[PDB]
Amino acid sequence: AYTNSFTRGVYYPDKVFRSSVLHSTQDLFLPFFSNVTWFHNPVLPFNDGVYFASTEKSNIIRGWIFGTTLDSKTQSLLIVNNATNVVIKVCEFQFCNDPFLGVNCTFEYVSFKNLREFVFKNIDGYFKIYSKHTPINLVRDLPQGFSALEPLVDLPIGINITRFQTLLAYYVGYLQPRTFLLKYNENGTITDAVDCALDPLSE
Amino acid sequence: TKCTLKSFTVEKGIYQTSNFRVQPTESIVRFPNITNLCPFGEVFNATRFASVYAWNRKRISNCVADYSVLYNSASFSTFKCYGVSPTKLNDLCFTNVYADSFVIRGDEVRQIAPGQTGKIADYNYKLPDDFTGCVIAWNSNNLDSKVGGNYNYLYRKPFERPLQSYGFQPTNGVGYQPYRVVVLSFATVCGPKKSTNLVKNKCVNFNFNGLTGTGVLTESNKKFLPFQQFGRDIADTTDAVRDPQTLEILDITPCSFGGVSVITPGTNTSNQVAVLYQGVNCTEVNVFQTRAGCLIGAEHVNNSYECDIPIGAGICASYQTSQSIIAYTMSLGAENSVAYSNNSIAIPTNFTISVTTEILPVSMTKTSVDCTMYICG
Amino acid sequence: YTMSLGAENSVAYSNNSIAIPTNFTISVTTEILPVSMTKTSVDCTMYICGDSTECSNLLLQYGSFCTQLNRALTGIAVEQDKNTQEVFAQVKQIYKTPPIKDFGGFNFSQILPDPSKSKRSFIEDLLFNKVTNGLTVLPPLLTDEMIAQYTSALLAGTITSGWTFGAGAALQIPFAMQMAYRFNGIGVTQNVLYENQKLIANQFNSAIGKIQDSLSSTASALGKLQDVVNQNAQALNTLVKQLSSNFGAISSVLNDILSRLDKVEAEVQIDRLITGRLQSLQTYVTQQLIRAAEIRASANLAATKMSECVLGQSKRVDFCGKGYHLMSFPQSAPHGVVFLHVTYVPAQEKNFTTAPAICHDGKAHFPREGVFVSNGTHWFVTQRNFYEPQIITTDNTFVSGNCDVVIGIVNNTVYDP
Amino acid sequence: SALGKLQDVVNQNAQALNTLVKQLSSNFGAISSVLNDILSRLDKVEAEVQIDRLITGRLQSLQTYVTQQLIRAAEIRASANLAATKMSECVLGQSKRVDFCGKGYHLMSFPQSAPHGVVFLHVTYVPAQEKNFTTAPAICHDGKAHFP
Ligand SMILES: *[C@@H]1O[C@H](CO)[C@@H](O[C@@H]2O[C@H](CO)[C@@H](O)[C@H](O)[C@H]2NC(C)=O)[C@H](O)[C@H]1NC(C)=O
Ligand SMILES: *[C@@H]1O[C@H](CO)[C@@H](O[C@@H]2O[C@H](CO)[C@@H](O)[C@H](O)[C@H]2NC(C)=O)[C@H](O)[C@H]1NC(C)=O
Ligand SMILES: *[C@@H]1O[C@H](CO)[C@@H](O[C@@H]2O[C@H](CO)[C@@H](O)[C@H](O)[C@H]2NC(C)=O)[C@H](O)[C@H]1NC(C)=O
Ligand SMILES: *[C@@H]1O[C@H](CO)[C@@H](O[C@@H]2O[C@H](CO)[C@@H](O)[C@H](O)[C@H]2NC(C)=O)[C@H](O)[C@H]1NC(C)=O
Ligand SMILES: *[C@@H]1O[C@H](CO)[C@@H](O)[C@H](O)[C@H]1NC(C)=O
Ligand SMILES: *[C@@H]1O[C@H](CO)[C@@H](O)[C@H](O)[C@H]1NC(C)=O
Ligand SMILES: *[C@@H]1O[C@H](CO)[C@@H](O)[C@H](O)[C@H]1NC(C)=O
Ligand SMILES: *[C@@H]1O[C@H](CO)[C@@H](O)[C@H](O)[C@H]1NC(C)=O
Ligand SMILES: *[C@@H]1O[C@H](CO)[C@@H](O)[C@H](O)[C@H]1NC(C)=O
Ligand SMILES: *[C@@H]1O[C@H](CO)[C@@H](O)[C@H](O)[C@H]1NC(C)=O
Ligand SMILES: *[C@@H]1O[C@H](CO)[C@@H](O)[C@H](O)[C@H]1NC(C)=O
Ligand SMILES: *[C@@H]1O[C@H](CO)[C@@H](O)[C@H](O)[C@H]1NC(C)=O
Ligand SMILES: *[C@@H]1O[C@H](CO)[C@@H](O)[C@H](O)[C@H]1NC(C)=O
Ligand SMILES: *[C@@H]1O[C@H](CO)[C@@H](O)[C@H](O)[C@H]1NC(C)=O
Ligand SMILES: *[C@@H]1O[C@H](CO)[C@@H](O)[C@H](O)[C@H]1NC(C)=O
Ligand SMILES: *[C@@H]1O[C@H](CO)[C@@H](O)[C@H](O)[C@H]1NC(C)=O
Ligand SMILES: *[C@@H]1O[C@H](CO)[C@@H](O)[C@H](O)[C@H]1NC(C)=O
Ligand SMILES: *[C@@H]1O[C@H](CO)[C@@H](O)[C@H](O)[C@H]1NC(C)=O
């Protein structure tokens, strides 16, 4: 199944304040009005990095796994929100097809009513996470509107990623190298964007 | 001015002879509060280590390498390097640090050093003479062996396990006395981020988190979002920063600069001159603040005259009477209330035939350049 | 769609028909001219090398380039003061207006100085409101307050003394009588002014009111001046943005190159930044020289307009707005000037039968000034630009030869007074 | 100081030529700016690298000179078109264009040659020695209004 992404999946591209100004930037972004694949789960490609989002009122989605095999051969990311912390590790993990709720190693780290949105990407050996949270009034699709995602995590871990899967009403779409024009307001938040390749008016 | 114009005679005018630029008074460096130091106590302060016949590996990343403290401390009896010296290594970095360590009799430890000779260097605790760092050691007769000797240990590829049973003893000579040693080589495992105090309102050279510049740092009211580090102007230019040790925002203004412009009468008339520091405020440098810049060596005057040498923003200067350069607001001309009324006319009763010269250029010197002969001769 | 060039009009021509305007409208048409760029100078060593000594030493190998650039921009900068002074400083004395305002019913209050404001006029305040790394902007020589004293002097001379303040010392003349000269200067017999003085004053006052409304209703009127401000900002922003470009160097941040590399490799990488930034600065200075030549052509046009069109009464068709030119008033504006061209436009024509000459006693009579017309039953002589029918007389007409030679002559009495 | 325009047109061209000559001494990154140093000291595979720097720099210096001379020639042509317009309207005629032919009511002008230019001696009537008078737009007689 598929749904329309609308104007969602934009994120702060760099750690920089800009105010009351329009900045044109090329980065791996979810294209506007793209087909975001919908799930009610299987292993998925990672490609140029991933937008992921889930509609929630339950906190049943909890984590992710990433790598080439995601099993035994090489170091692979595990990420889990356990309500005490966000827990991260990169071991050569081995498990059943995917662990689920009943409701060697080289690095480690620790830190419907709503939508949780995320972006996962891997550039220059940095695995990056961005996210946002909002209340909503629609269950079956992403709500039409705008809210830029902001960074959480920036791991220098250098792992090769080509597959991922989710641990647990969720949505997946692929980032692509595209120019966007970003509207920073007077307080330096991104408040609107143009996907330049969308249509001739956007160009 | 004579040098700027490549001439010993200078005509009346204003000449941009130099560009003034306020110098950075000092250098500032800022990085976050020190954290995540590498746990070297497991090598330097531990009572034992792996046998010289079977050496053990170590590694670190996402951490601060306290190598300057490791070199300065008395906890090591000696050290030596296959790479750069510890004064450079205290500011070195790698994507991760890699290492190995062992315990033995002190001469058996020496037999496993980078570029050493013995069964340890051959295979049991190996290390190349070209290794990308340094090795260090200390005595261990109080912990690495009993009063009966280290007879439970072993003695002798790189940084890993040519071998036999151990024989170190605390009552023996300095080669047989127990000791512990290690070696290492080379972004995530860097040396510490040495940092200064912060200076506002002076022109300063600065570093914040590895961006650099020169400017006047000032307290500011720009509301950066919690993840944002730097602020930018409309045309890419950095114009604010977050201080990494106390998360307030500093607005950055350029250190004051402008064209030094020498106002002179002709060198026929005088050797006295006045200097306009264009756009500069006199606090940053007789003295007179014009809207065009700080003007030095001219008298401000409350009369007004035709413009002789133009300064800008309505100001002109001239050499005048007992003589000096004066600077004044230019006179646009004498005022005249025309005697208008609904029934008054003025009619000329006489004339002057006036002959006024007008001069127009019409042609340049006709040049031709043989560009093959100019370029290649 | 295929565009239309304008409405079709088959002019009602025939060999004996003339259309003479029975009435006029005074029109006031704004014209807006650029006069000066933003005066600029670049510390090209600070632009190219950012106060790095390692780069500054390499930039010496390029010789006179980072010196003839400063000389070129200094030539442009001094030329902007010349452009501004050629336009406004055409007046020898700062003429000023009397306390009384007995200008025959004409109302200049919206274009004369407002002492509550600098002391710009009301319309000059609308015009000033509608316009909006080693680089330095230098101030103009004349401040906006000095420019407003010149436009005040030009305007106060123009009102109190006509063209006479251009040809010599200003000679006062009543404003109704100055406009009577402006009417003779377009071939309209001056009694047409004095007999219509209230109507002409109301048309002028109302037309000045429409300038305030036009300037309040849209910013797009000042497109020429706002375009000059935009092009200066666009050029400087482009020149600054080009500091971020690599030009094939390993980074555009010069302190990266000096810390990433050994000195031999660093000098090669820095020389790419020097070459690219120097080529970028030569590109900027070349565009500013060509743009300054464009602004100088506009400043020479504005200076020529002020001489012929403010200080005089230009007889050059469409040099001073559409219609026959009466006078114009200068108003200052940011980086430019505005002329309020006052022009006579004829407005309510009647068709008449006409003849080139009239036979009396075999003598062919021609009009001394004006043209013959008939209302259908009677023959009159009339000035060309306003229908005023006068009896045909030996005073209004001159003889030459006899009836036989003239194609299309007609027979009527000529009254001998 | 009257002929500042013509002597400046001479000076601009002299400064442009002298700048273009002095640029022959610039290295542009080569081992020397004397082209015979390079050709005597270096063998072809090295020499051509250094001569490419001198060619690139000297060629960029000519493109700079010729660009500035094209723009300066456009300025001088605008002045020559103005001088030609003055000679047509102002010598060969009597211009009514205010301040086109000197400050005054224009009578005539005489052209005189000057190096790189022309000089016009604009003969103009300037009025003087005015008197104030009472004035009127028109005058009544037998109820009819008379105008001059
Ligand atoms: C000439 O044209 C003007 C308009 O430009 C006429 O003036 C208007 O006359 C009407 C009445 O006929 C009034 O309602 C308007 O208010 C007048 N306008 C102005 C600006 O005064 C004028 O009547 C015409 N004159 C002749 C002789 O035809
Ligand atoms: C000249 O014209 C101005 C308007 O262009 C007249 O001033 C306005 O007068 C009306 C009626 O008194 C007021 O409602 C406006 O507020 C005035 N405007 C300003 C800016 O003052 C002025 O009275 C006229 N003067 C003469 C002598 O006719
Ligand atoms: C053409 O003009 C003449 C003169 O103005 C007009 O003749 C006068 O007409 C009025 C009545 O409209 C009479 O009171 C006068 O006595 C006439 N004067 C003469 C000398 O005849 C004539 O009517 C006009 N014709 C048209 C077609 O407009
Ligand atoms: C103008 O008036 C004259 C008379 O004053 C007209 O001349 C007559 O023309 C007819 C026809 O050619 C002849 O029979 C008469 O002998 C002519 N008389 C004279 C004295 O020459 C003339 O035709 C009229 N012209 C127009 C254009 O109306
Ligand atoms: C992908 O999106 C386009 C509209 O953007 C739509 O026409 C197309 O049918 C979608 N593809 C799928 C598999 O639904
Ligand atoms: C979350 O993970 C940490 C280890 O990362 C563990 O100590 C803690 O008990 C866990 N909490 C919950 C609620 O599972
Ligand atoms: C652990 O690393 C060794 C090599 O150091 C390798 O032989 C072994 O297969 C690895 N095991 C896992 C589970 O990654
Ligand atoms: C990632 O893959 C490349 C080949 O695509 C390989 O050279 C590199 O060593 C791999 N790195 C890791 C950490 O797996
Ligand atoms: C900016 O933030 C302040 C509070 O810090 C708020 O009052 C204001 O409304 C905000 N303005 C915009 C344009 O978001
Ligand atoms: C080792 O122990 C001593 C005890 O005085 C302490 O001062 C030193 O900091 C310790 N060094 C390390 C590397 O833990
Ligand atoms: C750094 O440490 C000082 C105390 O030493 C503390 O006041 C300050 O808040 C700390 N800053 C950060 C960014 O943690
Ligand atoms: C300046 O000196 C020169 C000779 O050196 C002379 O020709 C010139 O007339 C002098 N000018 C003035 C203004 O004194
Ligand atoms: C800067 O110049 C202004 C006048 O232009 C003056 O009032 C002010 O004191 C100067 N700034 C400082 C810090 O002195
Ligand atoms: C010049 O004018 C200022 C006020 O503008 C006054 O303080 C000063 O005393 C005056 N000096 C002279 C010499 O007139
Ligand atoms: C007119 O002026 C001249 C000097 O320009 C003078 O000699 C002559 O006497 C004057 N004539 C009259 C009538 O005033
Ligand atoms: C003049 O008359 C012709 C018809 O004879 C008519 O077509 C034309 O519109 C008229 N023009 C005016 C201004 O009345
Ligand atoms: C005017 O028009 C028609 C056609 O040309 C002609 O019959 C008539 O004679 C002409 N009249 C004159 C005076 O030329
Ligand atoms: C004309 O008369 C006024 C006084 O009514 C006087 O101020 C003015 O100077 C006189 N002008 C001339 C040229 O005589």
Side-chain angles (χ1 to χ4, degrees), chain C residues 296-313:
Chain C
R296 183 183 59 247
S298 184
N300 291 349
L301 178 57
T304 305
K305 300 248 178 176
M306 207 159 299
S307 306
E308 299 182 29
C309 207
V310 180
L311 274 69
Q313 184 183 10

Side-chain angles (χ1 to χ4, degrees), chain B residues 267-290 292-300:
Chain B
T267 51
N268 284 59
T269 301
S270 189
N271 294 297
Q272 293 177 335
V273 302
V275 181
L276 173 74
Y277 293 85
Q278 289 172 326
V280 180
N281 189 317
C282 296
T283 301
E284 304 173 321
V285 185
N286 192 62
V287 181
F288 168 28
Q289 181 69 63
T290 77
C294 189
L295 175 59
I296 298 191
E299 294 178 13
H300 176 239

Side-chain angles (χ1 to χ4, degrees), chain C residues 135-143 146-216 218-261 263-264 266-321 323-368 370-400:
Chain C
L135 280 49
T136 63
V137 169
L138 302 176
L141 178 61
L142 290 68
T143 62
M146 290 177 168
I147 302 291
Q149 286 180 56
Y150 281 126
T151 62
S152 178
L154 291 155
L155 180 53
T158 301
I159 292 159
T160 58
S161 72
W163 49 67
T164 69
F165 85 94
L171 299 170
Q172 75 274 12
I173 185 171
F175 194 86
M177 298 184 69
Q178 164 170 335
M179 279 287 283
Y181 295 181
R182 303 312 189 128
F183 271 45
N184 281 124
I186 64 164
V188 178
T189 306
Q190 58 172 239
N191 70 297
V192 175
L193 172 67
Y194 301 127
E195 294 172 31
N196 299 283
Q197 184 178 325
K198 296 185 182 181
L199 172 61
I200 289 162
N202 289 349
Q203 286 180 356
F204 175 70
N205 297 349
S206 177
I208 289 289
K210 293 180 182 183
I211 309 311
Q212 300 179 269
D213 297 348
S214 178
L215 292 179
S216 304
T218 185
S220 67
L222 278 76
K224 289 178 178 180
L225 306 184
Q226 188 61 51
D227 182 21
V228 169
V229 175
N230 290 352
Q231 285 185 48
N232 296 181
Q234 179 66 273
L236 288 161
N237 285 351
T238 301
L239 179 65
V240 175
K241 290 283 295 190
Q242 282 289 71
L243 294 174
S244 304
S245 304
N246 289 67
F247 312 105
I250 191 160
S251 175
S252 58
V253 175
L254 181 62
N255 295 350
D256 294 354
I257 302 175
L258 290 167
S259 59
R260 288 173 71 90
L261 292 170
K263 295 184 179 183
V264 182
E267 287 169 15
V268 174
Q269 296 289 320
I270 295 172
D271 187 60
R272 284 183 163 278
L273 295 189
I274 291 169
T275 302
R277 289 176 180 179
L278 180 55
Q279 184 176 9
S280 175
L281 184 62
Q282 282 174 1
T283 297
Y284 166 76
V285 175
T286 299
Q287 287 169 15
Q288 295 293 56
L289 260 60
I290 296 158
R291 187 176 291 117
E294 180 180 358
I295 296 295
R296 183 183 59 247
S298 184
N300 291 349
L301 178 57
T304 305
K305 300 248 178 176
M306 207 159 299
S307 306
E308 299 182 29
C309 207
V310 180
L311 274 69
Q313 184 183 10
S314 196
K315 218 176 192 294
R316 295 170 61 200
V317 175
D318 304 358
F319 190 62
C320 294
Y324 309 132
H325 181 61
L326 291 168
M327 61 198 162
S328 67
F329 303 120
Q331 298 287 267
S332 57
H335 294 351
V337 67
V338 178
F339 296 90
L340 307 187
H341 300 305
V342 189
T343 72
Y344 179 105
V345 175
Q348 295 184 310
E349 61 270 20
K350 274 183 65 170
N351 293 323
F352 302 94
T353 300
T354 184
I358 290 184
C359 284
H360 192 48
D361 293 333
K363 290 177 290 186
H365 289 272
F366 305 77
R368 275 188 172 98
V371 62
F372 295 127
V373 289
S374 178
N375 71 354
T377 60
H378 292 73
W379 278 97
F380 304 119
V381 57
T382 298
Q383 45 155 321
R384 310 180 202 299
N385 290 304
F386 184 86
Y387 181 65
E388 183 174 39
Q390 292 166 332
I391 301 300
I392 303 179
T393 64
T394 55
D395 294 346
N396 292 327
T397 63
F398 68 88
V399 176
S400 189

Side-chain angles (χ1 to χ4, degrees), chain B residues 19 21 236 314 335-336 340, chain C residues 43 93 96 102 141 241 244:
Chain B
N19 299 326
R21 199 179 305 113
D236 295 358
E335 69 181 319
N336 183 345
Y340 177 93
Chain C
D43 181 5
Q93 294 191 338
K96 67 183 187 182
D102 50 329
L141 178 61
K241 290 283 295 190
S244 304

Side-chain angles (χ1 to χ4, degrees), chain B residues 74 81 83 86 93 99 106 113-115 118 121 128 133-134 137 148-149 158 162 167 170 173 175 178 187 190-192 195-218 220-247 249-290 292-305 307-342:
Chain B
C81 298
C93 194
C134 307
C190 306
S195 296
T196 68
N197 195 15
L198 178 74
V199 173
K200 299 180 185 175
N201 302 300
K202 298 190 177 72
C203 171
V204 288
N205 178 50
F206 61 77
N207 184 322
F208 292 92
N209 295 351
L211 288 177
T212 59
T214 58
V216 181
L217 308 181
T218 63
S220 81
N221 55 16
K222 294 182 187 294
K223 298 299 186 179
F224 284 22
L225 306 181
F227 65 93
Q228 290 167 340
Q229 308 303 314
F230 323 133
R232 292 182 191 258
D233 197 4
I234 309 302
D236 295 358
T237 299
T238 303
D239 72 351
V241 295
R242 185 182 297 276
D243 170 16
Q245 301 200 352
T246 288
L247 308 183
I249 306 308
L250 304 172
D251 175 318
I252 306 194
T253 298
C255 297
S256 187
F257 71 89
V260 181
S261 306
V262 182
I263 296 152
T264 186
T267 51
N268 284 59
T269 301
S270 189
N271 294 297
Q272 293 177 335
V273 302
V275 181
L276 173 74
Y277 293 85
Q278 289 172 326
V280 180
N281 189 317
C282 296
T283 301
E284 304 173 321
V285 185
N286 192 62
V287 181
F288 168 28
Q289 181 69 63
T290 77
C294 189
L295 175 59
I296 298 191
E299 294 178 13
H300 176 239
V301 165
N302 285 355
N303 298 312
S304 61
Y305 313 102
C307 187
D308 194 13
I309 305 164
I311 287 162
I315 304 301
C316 297
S318 64
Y319 173 85
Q320 293 291 318
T321 302
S322 305
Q323 304 205 302
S324 61
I325 297 178
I326 65 164
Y328 54 92
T329 297
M330 63 182 278
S331 183
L332 308 187
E335 69 181 319
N336 183 345
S337 54
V338 183
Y340 177 93
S341 69
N342 63 5

